[PDB]
């Protein structure tokens, strides 16, 4: 009703971990209008881990472009600065058509060109790349977006009431929270 339970139980994954994409209509709106996962921070208790990642699947050569850059956000702790101009980027200008296009979104908000560049080619980026797809591959991750709690529940919006938006995202977050009490 409120969530599934996988037939194939992960272990290792972190407490909550959620999947994305920046080409991805119901994830601009669960980011940018619905604020999911700032509500699930809130409503959860002062240590638990929240992982993000992005996903290959959509957007053509695109797709693993913005995988590679929202490792390299990863990796430089600036998930906070450009989320928001990504997805304007792609969605709303549509102005980003290219690698240099997701990099000059970076340099916008404040990192240096230099490190945005070395980032982008360290290997700790590349195990950042590896990492989010192993991620996906482990719940063979179908569609975006997607929300697990703890490698054995997966958030189902479809029984959610989308008629209100602050019931929606009240009763999301609340999910949440009585999953990874369980």
């Given at each position: 009703?409120?969530?599934?339970?996988?037939?194939?139980?992960?272990?290792?994954?972190?407490?909550?971990?959620?999947?994305?994409?920046?080409?991805?209509?119901?994830?601009?709106?669960?980011?940018?209008?619905?604020?999911?996962?700032?509500?699930?921070?809130?409503?959860?208790?002062?240590?638990?881990?929240?992982?993000?990642?992005?996903?290959?699947?959509?957007?053509?050569?695109?797709?693993?472009?913005?995988?590679?850059?929202?490792?390299?956000?990863?990796?430089?702790?600036?998930?906070?600065?450009?989320?928001?101009?990504?997805?304007?980027?792609?969605?709303?200008?549509?102005?980003?058509?290219?690698?240099?296009?997701?990099?000059?979104?970076?340099?916008?908000?404040?990192?240096?060109?230099?490190?945005?560049?070395?980032?982008?080619?360290?290997?700790?980026?590349?195990?950042?790349?590896?990492?989010?797809?192993?991620?996906?591959?482990?719940?063979?991750?179908?569609?975006?977006?997607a929300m697990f709690v703890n490698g054995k529940y997966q958030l189902?919006?479809?029984?959610?009431?989308?008629?209100?938006?602050?019931?929606?995202?009240?009763?999301?977050?609340?999910?949440?929270?009585?999953?990874?009490?369980?």
């Amino acid at each position: 009703k409120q969530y599934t339970t996988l037939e194939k139980p992960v272990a290792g994954a972190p407490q909550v971990l959620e999947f994305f994409s920046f080409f991805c209509p119901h994830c601009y709106q669960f980011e940018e209008v619905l604020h999911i996962s700032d509500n699930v921070k809130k409503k959860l208790p002062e240590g638990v881990k929240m992982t993000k990642y992005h996903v290959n699947f959509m957007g053509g050569d695109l797709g693993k472009d913005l995988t590679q850059a929202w490792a390299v956000a990863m990796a430089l702790g600036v998930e906070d600065k450009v989320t928001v101009p990504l997805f304007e980027g792609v969605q709303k200008t549509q102005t980003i058509r290219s690698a240099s296009d997701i990099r000059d979104v970076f340099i916008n908000a404040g990192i240096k060109g230099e490190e945005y560049d070395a980032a982008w080619n360290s290997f700790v980026v590349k195990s950042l790349v590896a990492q989010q797809e192993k991620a996906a591959a482990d719940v063979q991750l179908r569609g975006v977006p997607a929300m697990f709690v703890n490698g054995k529940y997966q958030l189902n919006p479809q029984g959610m009431d989308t008629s209100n938006m602050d019931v929606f995202v009240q009763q999301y977050a609340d999910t949440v929270k009585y999953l990874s009490e369980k």
